[PDB]
Design a protein around this ligand. Sequence first.
Ligand code: 6U4
Ligand code: NA
Ligand code: NA
Length: 156
Amino acid sequence: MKASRLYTLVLVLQPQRVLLGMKKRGFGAGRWNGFGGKVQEGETIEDGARRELQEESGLTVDALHKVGQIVFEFVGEPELMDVHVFATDSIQGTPVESDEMRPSWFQLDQIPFKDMWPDDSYWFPLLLQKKKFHGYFKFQGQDTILDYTLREVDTV
Ligand SMILES: Nc1[nH]c(=O)nc2c1ncn2[C@H]1C[C@H](O)[C@@H](COP(=O)(O)OP(=O)(O)OP(=O)(O)O)O1
Ligand code: NA
Ligand code: NA
């Protein structure tokens, strides 16, 4: 079996729009993503998701709700990424551009799927329907899915 590392992903989803972050330079520049990163020792996953949202975007919320869990496997990497996915309840602050990331709102009829991780095309729609999910995606590099599962669940 494999070991897994914990990550978070937060979708700042409002009734008509979603806030995404564009990676500004390096490996995978121009890709839009939710906000998140690695869970740290001692914090709950939800608290880590809030912390990462703040560090990454400048936003605070005071509450998230869990919407899904997705495991990513990359060819050549033995460690799995176990990504815990949340959506915001309500938000405080304006988002801020950093050296790493530029935030932008997108209307929900303009979700930039071609410039997002390919898996997002599969699980976003569930997210938008306010449903919960478990997923797994195996990637060759950044663009090619070799195997995946996706299942709606009642409890994440
Ligand atoms: N296939 C994928 N689909 C997706 O929608 N988000 C993905 C993804 N693969 C990775 N992500 C997200 C998960 C998480 O929010 C982020 C990856 O976290 P990072 O490794 O950048 O974390 P950290 O910034 O904590 O790491 P350090 O570089 O160690 O500081 O990208
Ligand atoms: Na981090
Ligand atoms: Na990050």
